[model samples]
Target: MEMEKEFEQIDKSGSWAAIYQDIRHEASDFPSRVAKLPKNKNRNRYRDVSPFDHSRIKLHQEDNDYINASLIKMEEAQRSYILTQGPLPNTVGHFWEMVWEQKSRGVVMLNRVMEKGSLKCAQYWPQKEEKEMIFEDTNLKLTLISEDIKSYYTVRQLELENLTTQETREILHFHYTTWPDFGVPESPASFLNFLFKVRESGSLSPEHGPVVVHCSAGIGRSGTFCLADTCLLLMDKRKDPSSVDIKKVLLEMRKFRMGLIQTADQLRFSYLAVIEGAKFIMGD
Candidate 1:
């Protein structure tokens, strides 16, 4: 009877059929939209300014610079790591180089998914074909970090699906948010739950190693998410409530990875989300 009841619920809820329909609809249009979006304009602005030309700025270099300068500070100070979204803008060689460089440190790529099958159903290491064909891995390097996923919030599920022990002992995944659809308002609970899960996973521990996060330009949504995570850490510690300073943290993040929290809307959402999360914790 319980099994029968479950089946009845599934049918009434349109679970199985709805899943397929959603997947089909998402897969149909996601790729085209992603292809049309601009590249990471924020990071691109730095190419000419940095001593190293854009081409000379390898994937590993970008990752390293971003992590060491921005991410590490945010993490150490108990801030969240937000990834941005945009088209892939680097080469396969650059991606491979990053992989090789961070391989020992346990890095994982968190790609965007338009459908349930995108990464959850992927059976092999993400290859160039899938990157190019389904995801539009064109001018973007195979390894350079960018926001390829248009409307996804969490990459934990994907990492859990694709990580191979032979490659690294730990894996980190990142996702980008867009307004009305993928942003905080549409999926605040999902985003909060994701951070809660990441915190529980103990992956942030030095023993487990660092987790990698990025977005199209390494600012905006990515920065917001990262800040949320840091705020969550602070809330967890039961630190002095009045001592928390998010703006200062944001400023530090910008020094290394410019344009973090690029939009006022994103910034407001991030601050509200952190407060909401704190309330949830305190209430609990």
Candidate 2:
């Protein structure tokens, strides 16, 4: 209950800045040599953020094995998430290739292709009118099967085909269209509902490969999403939801990647979401 009490006290006192700075100071400084290579320099969307070499997912292609993605494993929750950046125009092929090679069940997109006035993500997936798209670099074909639109998000059914082997797999595209860049959702209710929707689809289960989650930079919103989901899962398994320390969980997750839960505001929202989510798992 200490974590919850601390959350409540912070909510009342508004001292999140100090807490966030303290957590930032505690993060590990790991080298990203592979991501800094001249050959892979263009693959990253942001110059400041890159995946640690130890935890980055390696593409099978020997010619170009690098992709800006991290495999974050939460052994406590029995969950593995692939947190990555939005697809750069040239990296779109490698993006799907990683999805295909890793056997991912879903791709959770938290940012739009275009946000505010600039381009946040490439049009990686096919539009409704296009119906199908082929990436010659990876020899993969993507066809949109169906779309279910909700108020804040959209669930798209996609058929991914490995043209080289003619192998096909179904992948769900959970696009949270309403979430703003560098900002959170309107409330935790909508975000949790969407999270449960993904959970109910069997995409986040241990039986499947890691669910690919990304935002513009893959650290802010993506980190928040994974942190909240992991904490809630741990709460259910530990049988004592209040024992989960929100800061500790975030710190451990940051080891697999860098700069998770970027802003103090984003860190506070993670606490809010996890606290609200505990109520649902514990029941009425």
Candidate 3:
């Protein structure tokens, strides 16, 4: 009989490192022309981590549609997630513009604004004290409404308004605060708890626009989150929880955005979380 044996083979058998490299070996060397433009150079958070042109977000703005973000659509899962870098100071307006234009329901931020005494992501949202922030470039305003803090994450309720049209929409910000750079969460249970919390908000369904997810460089932590979530989703769909091919799923995701799951440990963490998550999805 088919069993949850495959996941165990990768993790329990302790072959995550070798499998991770095998996945990396199939990595795409796609071109990213616009990201290299002289004027757009400063908008990227990291010089080496640029979005491939084919899948990069082309905003309505004619001057440049160059936000360091990629739109990844996994059709079978009926999921399209926007994976992007933490907003640069100059791209903060573009960041919100993306949210507005894409009609995104939520933003999943997996890194802190500051990490290791350095700025990892720009403070894109208004401080709770400020109440509201207006992006003059994008002509949009963000208002902070509520915040619920857990040990490892903070879920912020925000309102986004298009100043020109006086149209406002609600957006949820899922900020994973304690996950360190290039490191896994304290536990798979904690991470899955956070994922379920986000899912409970109804922001991740097919009816809504893509959920925007990001970390610092928008690859390591960001990739890990999406990988785990996607694998769990596939498990839920298929009758056999063990049938989901985590490696192939990740390879497909990497096609749209480069360098997903930067560390071997991050790859291992995805496997751990997915296996742990299946217990819940499969009612075990």
Candidate 4:
């Protein structure tokens, strides 16, 4: 379903940003700005699950180290995944190598770029002078898939390897959006569609084989998407219609990965996303 209102580009230099910064700086000064907002009752019960707890699985000494470690863990996890933001790298050789070394079952990389530029870049990557080594991996099977949106197209390129005994697939793609608004109905739809398709094919095992998701630094958009899925799954297991707590679920996800949901806006988006997903799943 199309959103009733168009997304307005939020100017970081404007009033919105100023208010955001103020709230962030005074985060500890609770019962002030944040306390003024209406409380989401359903979210209160779930607030106990903090992101710090979930992140206890691993720790990194530095930011870069944490990223690398998360990447490794994501690869190792049965449902291993990564979420990259912005653009595709000049060469995915090194990244692909790491994925290969981990023996990851699957990978899904998401990006946000205009169609023309994204397509051009994807087309040029394998042909680039710096990517000769990547293209030379004859065993690597790659396929490009595209979906047209309102003004642009979401293009996904898949790379796979037939390991004779085990099969692996990697997804690299871009999504299109206009300024002010960033949500994409089709993107989530595509994800659920893919999941359903994989299940239907009987190729994805419930015990193993995870679809890796990456979008830039593997935070922000990627985190929200991941968290949305997690919350939906939890809600289903609980079978409690009024029990889904947005903050608690998000905090739990953050515990697993430091910046899983990043900003408050992203967190809020995740909250709404659950309702949308429920509708889809329940055929409401």
Per-residue lDDT of model 2, residues 183-259, tens digit only: 66658888988899989998898788899999999999999999999998888898566788989999999999999
For residue 3, give model 4's deviation from the true position in Å. 20
Better of 2 and 4 by TM-score: 2
Instruction: Compare the candidates by lDDT and give the number of the best one.
Output: 2
All candidates in order of TM-score, best leading: 2, 3, 1, 4
**Model 2 residue 25 distance off true place after TM-score fit, in angstroms:** 0.5
User: Per-residue lDDT tens digits of candidate 4, residues 52-111?
Assistant: 222211222232111122331322113334433222333343345444444444444345
| Tens-place lDDT digits, model 3, residues 85-188 | 98888889999999989988999998888888899878888877476798898899999988888888899999999999999999999988878654566578
Clashing pairs in 3: none
Query: What residue runs in model 1 are displaced by over 4 Å at the alpha carbon?
Result: 1-71, 75-89, 103-187
Where does candidate 3 stray beyond 4 Å? 1-15, 129-131
After superposition, candidate 4 runs with Cα above 4 Å error: 1-80, 83-91, 102-106, 113-159, 162-208
Candidate lDDT scores, in order, read 0.42, 0.91, 0.85, 0.41
The best candidate by TM-score is 2
